[PDB]
């Protein structure tokens, strides 16, 4: 197959390296995974040393971390928006490392409304009819209200992050290598990182 070798190409000066041996097994090269968004299809590949790597081929879930409060949730990926490597990786929705994806914000909304007891998202005009989040937001005791108020004092959220929670989709960068270990984890963008990636998405869209 394809070989990883520094001898198949030219020198520093420009001459040609004549082959003194053929392709080896330690010069192993395998084709790309190029995973998609769908039901979980992860194959196993025996590698050098008897170990196993995990090729994703279609994958939707991803355990994504939010770093200002350091909590991860298993979140389904729905869209691929930005990739600094190739424009074709944005055209055809292919997950690789350092992709900017739109992820569901409802587990982070549930965690925020269960921890800090503050409304998150919730465009004015709608109320929850199963009443479960209303029960989770109301019905507080005497001395635990001080702890909820001390949580409320340190619950400032950014403007662009608040707009993204209002839209319901967050921007997440894929940090784990998806085609090697099979997992496609990552972290939610915040601050100047999110401003830079939104400026690049706006420059792409025009």
């Amino acid at each position: 197959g394809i070989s990883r070798d520094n001898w198949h190409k030219r020198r520093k000066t420009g001459g040609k390296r004549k082959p003194y041996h053929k392709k080896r097994k330690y010069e192993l090269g395998r084709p790309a995974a190029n995973t998609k968004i769908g039901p979980r299809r992860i194959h196993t590949v025996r590698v050098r040393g008897g170990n196993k790597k995990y090729r994703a081929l279609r994958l939707d879930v991803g355990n994504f971390s939010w770093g200002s409060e350091c909590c991860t949730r298993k979140t389904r990926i729905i869209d691929v928006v930005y990739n600094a490597s190739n424009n074709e990786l944005v055209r055809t929705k292919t997950l690789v490392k350092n992709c900017i994806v739109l992820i569901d914000s409802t587990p982070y909304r549930q965690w925020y409304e269960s921890h800090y007891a503050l409304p998150l998202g919730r465009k004015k005009g709608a109320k929850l009819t199963p009443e479960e989040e209303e029960i989770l937001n109301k019905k507080r005791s005497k001395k635990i209200q001080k702890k909820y108020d001390e949580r409320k004092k340190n619950a400032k959220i950014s403007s662009l992050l608040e707009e993204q929670f209002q839209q319901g989709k967050l921007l997440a960068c894929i940090a784990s290598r998806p085609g090697q270990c099979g997992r496609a984890d990552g972290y939610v963008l915040e601050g100047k990182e999110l401003e830079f990636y939104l400026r690049k998405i706006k420059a792409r869209k025009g």
């Binding site: 600094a84 990636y197 690049k200």
Partner: protein, 143 residues
């Protein structure tokens, strides 16, 4: 200033999106009695191949050279004069091997003819296996 590439430029060690009520910069010692430069700590750039603010460690050999080419970006070409002794003809000869060394951007006052100190590391590219550790100015020419 910085961040002119397509992706975001940051250091993989430090975190910068903490709860706010200057960004923290990571640096490290290099060993072998070499002192760290001031601008590598004071600056706001990044470099993943810098021997002070990057994921690379200086091992093996520590050598020297003289700078002869600076036409490349984030790397320079040094020149190495050495004398070879043939056992038959008891004289010397001038040979030079001009290796490519990754010039870290912590040094800015670098011209040609400057004696530079290089150090062995992991191969960062096809022909670069060396980082610039310290830069000595050439003989004379204060301006």
């Amino acid at each position: 200033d910085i961040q002119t590439e397509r992706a975001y430029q940051k250091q993989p060690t430090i975190f910068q999106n903490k709860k706010r009520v200057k960004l923290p910069r990571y640096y490290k010692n290099i060993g072998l009695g070499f002192k760290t430069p001031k601008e590598a700590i004071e600056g706001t750039y990044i470099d993943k191949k810098c021997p002070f603010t990057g994921n690379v460690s200086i091992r093996g050999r520590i050598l020297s050279g003289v700078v002869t080419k600076m036409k490349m970006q984030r790397t320079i070409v040094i020149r190495r004069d050495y004398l070879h002794y043939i056992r038959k003809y008891n004289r010397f000869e001038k040979r030079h091997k001009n290796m490519s060394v990754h010039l870290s951007p912590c040094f800015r006052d670098v011209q040609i003819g400057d004696i530079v100190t290089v150090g062995e590391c992991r191969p960062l590219s096809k022909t670069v296996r060396f980082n610039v550790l310290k830069v000595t100015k050439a003989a004379g020419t204060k301006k």
